[PDB]
Amino acid sequence: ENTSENRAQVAARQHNRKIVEQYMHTRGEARLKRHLLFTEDGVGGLWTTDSGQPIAIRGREKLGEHAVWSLQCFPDWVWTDIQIFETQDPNWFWVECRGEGAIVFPGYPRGQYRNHFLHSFRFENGLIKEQREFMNPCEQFRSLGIEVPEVRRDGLPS
Amino acid sequence: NTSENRAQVAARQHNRKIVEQYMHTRGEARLKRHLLFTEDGVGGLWTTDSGQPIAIRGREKLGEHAVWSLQCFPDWVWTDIQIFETQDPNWFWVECRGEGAIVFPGYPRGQYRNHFLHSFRFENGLIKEQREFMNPCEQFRSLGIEVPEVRRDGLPS
Ligand SMILES: O=C(O)c1ccccc1NC1CCCCC1
Numbered sequence A: 001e002n003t004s005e006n007r008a009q010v011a012a013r014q015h016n017r018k019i020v021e022q023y024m025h026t027r028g029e030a031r032l033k034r035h036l037l038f039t040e041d042g043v044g045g046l047w048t049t050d051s052g053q054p055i056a057i058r059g060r061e062k063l064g065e066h067a068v069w070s071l072q073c074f075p076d077w078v079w080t081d082i083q084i085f086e087t088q089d090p091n092w093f094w095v096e097c098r099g100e101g102a103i104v105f106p107g108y109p110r111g112q113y114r115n116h117f118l119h120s121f122r123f124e125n126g127l128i129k130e131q132r133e134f135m136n137p138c139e140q141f142r143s144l145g146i147e148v149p150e151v152r153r154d155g156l157p158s
Numbered sequence B: 001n002t003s004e005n006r007a008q009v010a011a012r013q014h015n016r017k018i019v020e021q022y023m024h025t026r027g028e029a030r031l032k033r034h035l036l037f038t039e040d041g042v043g044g045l046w047t048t049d050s051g052q053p054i055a056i057r058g059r060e061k062l063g064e065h066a067v068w069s070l071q072c073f074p075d076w077v078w079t080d081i082q083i084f085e086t087q088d089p090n091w092f093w094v095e096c097r098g099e100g101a102i103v104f105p106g107y108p109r110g111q112y113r114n115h116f117l118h119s120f121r122f123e124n125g126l127i128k129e130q131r132e133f134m135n136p137c138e139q140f141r142s143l144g145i146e147v148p149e150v151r152r153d154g155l156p157s
């Protein structure tokens, strides 16, 4: 129905969507200001890690400091094949994408990293309150020259 | 308030109920969950150590995979289920946890728990593609398999 309440929702979703698009398109030196898309207490980071705990960077300033590390370790990164998923919550979006670029981790050789990613974006007052990255860490191991364990699934059909 | 829209609301409402069903299926009822797919529907695990998905294609093969699944994960349950509707009436995401016993040939019996994202794409009110995404490292752990530790050396605190 056409109500101002439903209109508010649409406008919120629409404004939020444009921020997701901006996030996912941010490259190079622009990455250093991408923290400004977050709430002051906003959280970002990697939720699928070998340790099992997330790497959660908390706060708009700590996120800016994190961008400096990210830009050196992933200097030429690009997200590709971006699919943005609005949800029934005008403040909650999912993104399915790929990404590729060099990976430069001290104590490993320079590598080429490619992976499939899912990102979660939750909003508050039109800024990002919580960004979470989900990927398969095994592809990151490969990129680092780290041997990947193999699970044998005997009986799996076929 | 067009029929165009009503049609989709209907599809989305219908499809959401099938996502709820899938996610709430336990026990012996797992052996018939393949029936919620299209005849040519695909399900399986998209985050593997090998880097390639384990994709099970067709209702028949899915029904066969359920027998495997019920042996290897005899008491599996999904919890903390959050279902996300999308702008596409035939596309849902689910974020959830899951846990249960893991009983694979050649590994010690373990307790497996993980965080999961599932994608469900529909055709004609049935599941045309279901995809599970998780962290394979937690499954390694469940089986006693060593997980390497990635060092991120100048990562700020
Ligand atoms: O992949 C990582 O090691 C990682 C660590 C903390 C935060 C995010 C991380 N993932 C991003 C780093 C920049 C884009 C490519 C992957």
Ligand SMILES: O=C(O)c1ccccc1NC1CCCCC1
Residues within 6 Å of the ligand: A153, B044, B045, B054, B069, B073, B076, B098, B132, B139
């Ligand atoms: O986790 C697995 O090894 C697996 C392999 C093929 C298809 C699906 C898989 N994951 C499901 C198996 C059934 C219990 C919950 C996780």
